[PDB]
From a paper:
As presented in the taxonomic analysis, Bacteroidaceae bacterium MAG57 encompasses a remarkable number of CAZyme-encoding genes including a gene cluster targeting arabinoxylan (CC102), an abundant hemicellulose in secondary cell walls of sugarcane and other grasses. This cluster encodes two exo-enzymes from families GH43 and GH97, and an unconventional GH10 member with an unknown 45 kDa N-terminal domain. The GH10 domain of CapGH10 exhibits endo-β-1,4-xylanase activity, being active on both xylan and distinct arabinoxylans.
To get further insights into the potential role of this unconventional N-terminal domain, its crystallographic structure was solved by SeMet phasing at 1.8 Å resolution. The domain behaves as a monomer in solution and exhibits a parallel right-handed β-helix fold, consisting of 14 complete helical turns with two main short helices protruding from the β-helix backbone. The 14 helical turns are twisted and curved with a calcium ion between the 11th and 12th turns in an octahedral coordination sphere. Neither the catalytically relevant residues nor the active site topology of these families is conserved in the CapGH10 β-helix domain, supporting that this domain is not catalytically active. In order to elucidate the molecular determinants for xylan binding observed in AGE experiments, two surface regions populated with aromatic and acidic residues, typical platforms for carbohydrate interaction, were identified and mutated. The region I between the turns 1–4 and the region II near to turns 6–10. Mutation D344L (at the calcium-binding site) also affected protein stability, but the arabinoxylan/xylan binding capacity was preserved. This result indicates that calcium ion has a structural relevance rather than a functional role in carbohydrate recognition. Only the mutants Y62A and E82A, affected the migration pattern in AGE assays with beechwood xylan and rye arabinoxylan. Both residues are located at the region I, indicating that this patch plays a role in carbohydrate binding.
Numbering used by the authors: 26 to 446
Amino acid sequence: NVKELDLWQDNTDASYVTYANSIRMGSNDYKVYTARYTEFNSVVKGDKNFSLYCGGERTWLGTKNGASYPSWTDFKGELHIYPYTKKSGCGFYGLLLSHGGKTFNPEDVAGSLEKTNSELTNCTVTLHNGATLAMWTGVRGVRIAELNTEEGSIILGPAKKGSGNGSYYVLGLSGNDALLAGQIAPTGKDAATKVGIIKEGAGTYRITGNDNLITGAIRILEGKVMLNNDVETARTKKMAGAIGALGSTNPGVYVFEGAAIGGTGHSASIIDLYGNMEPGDNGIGTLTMADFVTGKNVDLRLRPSSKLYFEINSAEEYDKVIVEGNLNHWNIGQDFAPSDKTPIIYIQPSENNTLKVGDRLTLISAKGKTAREDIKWNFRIQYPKSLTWEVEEIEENGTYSLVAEVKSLDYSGQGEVDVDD
Ligand SMILES: [Ca+2]
């Protein structure tokens, strides 16, 4: 049944509550109520529900200042993080993850991992409405196999502002899909304070918040991220969307080779596309790049390895990319070596499509086409094994479009060439 650890007390920085007795859950769910200042430093083993009701902004999983953390690798259950607002006026109500004196390098993820807090890699974690999940100062990482957040929750990153403070949440190792519906943004929306997501594993993470500011960017190493915020509302009300705006230099999304970005919402930051772009979410949709808050151009940064997949049901229903900015091709690969290979467009009619001769599909619309070093480039096209196509790259009235036109319902062999060789 249930064990309850009620550790709450109206305490201060000078009277921390510390609980460190090992827990073997057995057949019991646990419910733990923490004080504002709490060191929850118990080794936990079991496969039951562990619910952590956090009484303030100094409840640590581990010790003060994130100096150490207990073993949770034998915890295989569900960790649920809730607020507990009995003590009012706190900066936030949630859990501070520890770093164990270790620093994370977002540029060398593989080399950072084996010394990063990886205790929550055999369980699931759910961050509930009103709860915050934060880290301390410095540049820190945590590996969480499966994280879902509810609307009204906050992935904060560092508990305090600073250019030297950065928090990277390495999510997805379970291989399962998850939903980040709560906010992802640093304290005070401070632009210099970094909070980042690093996506690994085979599954897809869906991001739906409309007021994010992912200052440490999303780095997609494996699987997919869908930006599924309410873009129509974000346009009208001038909201940040799923990413927010990082400016004209730093990408908000790095899609590495083999991984994918997609969705029905929008990025207000540069997408650096080494990998795949799949508009919609396992189906037809429109993905937008646009900054509704500050009105600046947002470019799609294309690479020699870029691939863009367009599913097409009809002239009325097909995948679209809209860029309120330029298609900006960099002839530099993931390894910094030059290549003259250009992005591939995959034209993919559905199994029950109603395409007709003369249908013109505007797959990509942008303000312009640009390039590192002003080197001219065109998309390579992977045609399907049906119909006959003309692809038209059109610059007109100071705007750009990539159009696929159906010339015949008969097949003319255009799909026999495997472009990616
Ligand atoms: Ca699609």
